[PDB]
């Protein structure tokens, strides 16, 4: 279940000939930097069923060339990428390899990751509590803390005596920790009466049943 | 059911720093990157190793091409440069903070370029070099980068943290504070 991951092969750009003028570049008398950056994106619309390979090339701050498997050959996003488009598209040996990568790289790799990344599940830790201290200036914020969960697919809703509170909701949105876990705070703004019961419901794939916490 | 996912092979080479990177991303998170020097594969989470493997040499071969290509791009544009793009910094706890319970502080560096930065964790005004870790330069949807720095800590009302970040696109270093808020 530990097959070897495949990588998209980088192609050699050709120089010697050509040069562009007036490179409308921010400049800004700061420290000159030069970056060759490439992103090969495998998009899966339903597992390997349908796939789209999107390769994008950036020189410094601009995308100057790409390869979209929906098109089948390279296209220049800016003039600076025009020479490479013409060169690689002329190499049929290469255009084939690239087209094949949707299978040899994208689908290949997906099958490997489908064994541990696609099914990764970490159940959220759900907590509810009153915001601030006692002094209630104008509102009394109720915090529903949902943390340490994965994937990001989650639904956090507030209820007041069974009714779902739409307005008065304040969220930090989905927060990515960079370590394969997310966290979020969904706060409710209300004006309690007496025997008013508030509930935070959390739905997430890791769960077999929604999770509710009352206050 | 319909599984929608994105795997991105992100690589780059930068001058004059002479630095490169090669990593894989899954729905926004790092699966692994290759240490260009050691020439070894580094899995974001240890547990990933038992399910797959990657020949590091592949990353280095590609970096060599990215390196050669970088030179061509510089010739093709008469070494014209763009402006440096400063990052936005955000500090935050990984999870809810309870006094006495081990936790982790996160210094999130976002939307910047080139992929080079200097980060320093500060606890009570002093640089902390123990219990810190960081991610390589992570990709965004655009052409900019993001990075995560981490500091292990024990919540307390007597400690005061600062994440000091420096970039060629900043006039003065960016300094973000964080302390236990009840
Ligand atoms: C930079 O490119 C311009 C073309 O617009 C050229 O005239 C100039 O001489 C180049 N830089 C140098 C070598 O001065
Ligand atoms: C998605 O792919 C699966 C096979 O993996 C298939 O059963 C399903 O019909 C496809 N489309 C839908 C409706 O999700
Ligand atoms: C980052 O720190 C290094 C010290 O090793 C220094 O050479 C470099 O100038 C610093 N980067 C910036 C943007 O100042």
TrEMBL record, chain A:
It is a single-pass type I membrane protein. One of its GO terms (cellular component) is MHC class II protein complex. The keyword Ion transport does not apply. The keyword Membrane applies. Keywords: Adaptive immunity, Disulfide bond, Glycoprotein, Immunity, Membrane, MHC II, Signal, Transmembrane, Transmembrane helix. Its main location: membrane. Glycans are attached at residue 46. Residues 124-214 form the Ig-like domain. It is found in: Membrane. Disulfide bonds join 42-106, 144-200. One of its GO terms (biological process) is adaptive immune response. Belongs to the MHC class II family. This is MHC class II antigen IEk-beta. It comes from Mus musculus (Mouse).
